[PDB]
């Protein structure tokens, strides 16, 4: 049984768990207490040498980097559950393109925002609201590209749900709830409909029930 | 024949071209003048809607995000030239892990450094040396993990050269030349040997001959 390391509430562990749930892969969650810096101490650095979560252990196989992990499990269990990768090399490439868009254009801004608005106040530090503003204005321009895409295609990589969509679930939820920036999605009709669809999937609802969201 | 858009000198176009050269894929380079902001104007935004390079056009197939592109061509031409992906799903996962390490842990720091040290002075702006210092200190800690890995494995993802190594070529060259931070590699014996190996590959030398490096 796969072991997943990290808090249930954290974005990158959730990305992994969402894929495992979609693919029907049993796992055991091992909390790592990011609040207290457990991920930076020697025991955990033997598992993830950059001191970040998640890592997975699957027998004597060990893997980190959330987007590497979801690609691995989507392939290992391709012929079960939803096709998350695409079939043809061109379909697979479009999944990869929209993962790459998620991982930089989108997530660099969303993380920055959530870190200032949500993470830092929890440890007694004021966020930099002016900086958050700059991220918000960049993110509107990124999401205008999403809206254009979703006007043409039901999901990001084509007409079916894939890893590309899945990878957005955890951070987007924080963006539109805890960070108070739901307008970024609600202002964009196709994006809003996409969000209400993907975030209502049974695997995601199960994970949110576990996490308390 | 594949069309690749972007300057020959730029990092992400070079990442793509390195893969095409390794795989023996013919291409035509279409310069995009980043110096003058061509990538932000309407004509180019029809090709890459985030206003960045590269994009590839391969008949009526269009793809952007450099790491999506190199995965596509490594798969489309798997049975020719070097195996860049790995064979087993676990080998492929380790390639993906080290691509993910390149794409965030490594490249976020190297880009930041090169932007301040190299890009901004070329447009008449002083870089923020204090900020560059902070990046340099983070990057030493990242590269200590690389050194540990390369003590155990010839290349990053295993005993052979893969996409994981390839993806580092363009930015590392800037880091150790134009940015003046060659000590980051030279200080680390296994990393230095890895660098002198991968950057001497014939495909890379050909590309550097084209680019003027
Ligand atoms: O330093 C931290 C500590 C945390 O507990 C978390 C951190 C950073 O980042 C959060 C996070 C928030 C938003 C994102 O887009 C993202 O990639 C990660 C994570 O959920 C939880
Ligand atoms: O705004 C720019 C303009 C550019 O011409 C370049 C930019 C940014 O980034 C450079 C760059 C430099 C270092 C990197 O690690 C990286 O990912 C990209 C690129 O080579 C060339
Ligand atoms: N590129 C990594 C990012 C991992 C990451 O940022 N993890 C966060 C949780 S979402 C973390 O461990 N934060 C605490 C820290 O960085 O100290 C991946 O995708 O796995
Ligand atoms: N995530 C993108 C990054 C592309 C990117 O940053 N491209 C740079 C060149 S290396 C660019 O176009 N810079 C100019 C700009 O951002 O305006 C990819 O990997 O393709
Ligand atoms: Na990780
Ligand atoms: Na990340
Ligand atoms: Na304001
Ligand atoms: Na698009
Ligand atoms: Na919890
Ligand atoms: Na691109
Ligand atoms: Na990038
Ligand atoms: Na100093
Ligand atoms: Na390692
Ligand atoms: Na040139």
Numbering used by the authors:
A (entry chain A), B (entry chain A): 2 to 214
Give the exact sentences the study uses for this entry.
Through biochemical and structural analysis, here we show that anthocyanin-related glutathione transferases, currently implicated only in anthocyanin transport, catalyse an essential dehydration of the leucoanthocyanidin dioxygenase product, flavan-3,3,4-triol, to generate cyanidin. Using PtGSTF8 from poplar as a model enzyme, we use biochemical, structural and computational methods to demonstrate that arGSTs employ a GSH-dependent Brønsted base mechanism for conversion of the LDOX product flavan-3,3,4-triol or flavan-3-on-4-ol into flav-2-en-3,4-diol (8-B4), an equilibrium form of cyanidin. Based on the here-presented biochemical, structural and computational evidence, we propose that arGSTs utilize a GSH-dependent Brønsted base mechanism for conversion of the semi-stable LDOX product flavan-3,3,4-triol or flavan-3-on-4-ol into flav-2-en-3,4-diol (8-B4), the 4-hydration species of cyanidin.
To better understand the catalytic machinery of arGSTs, we determined the crystal structure of PtGSTF8 as a ternary complex with GSH and the substrate analogue (−)-catechin to a resolution of 1.09 Å. The structure comprises the typical GST fold with an N-terminal thioredoxin-like domain (β1α1β2α2β3β4α3) and an all-helical C-terminal domain (α4α5α6α7α8). The active-site cavity, which is located between the two domains, comprises a glutathione binding site (G-site), formed mainly by the N-terminal domain, and a hydrophobic substrate-binding site (H-site), which is formed by the C-terminal domain. Within the H-site, the substrate analogue interacts through hydrogen bonds to N108 and the backbone of V12, a π–π interaction with F112, water bridges to R16 and Y175, and hydrophobic interactions with V12 and V115. The best binding poses for both substrates had a highly similar conformation to (−)-catechin, with an RMSD of matched atoms of 0.51 Å for flavan-3,3,4-triol and 0.54 Å for flavan-3-on-4-ol. The docking analyses revealed that the positioning of the GSH-thiolate in relation to C-2 and O-3 of the docked substrates could enable an acid–base mechanism of dehydration or tautomerization, in which the GSH cofactor acts as a proton-relay system.
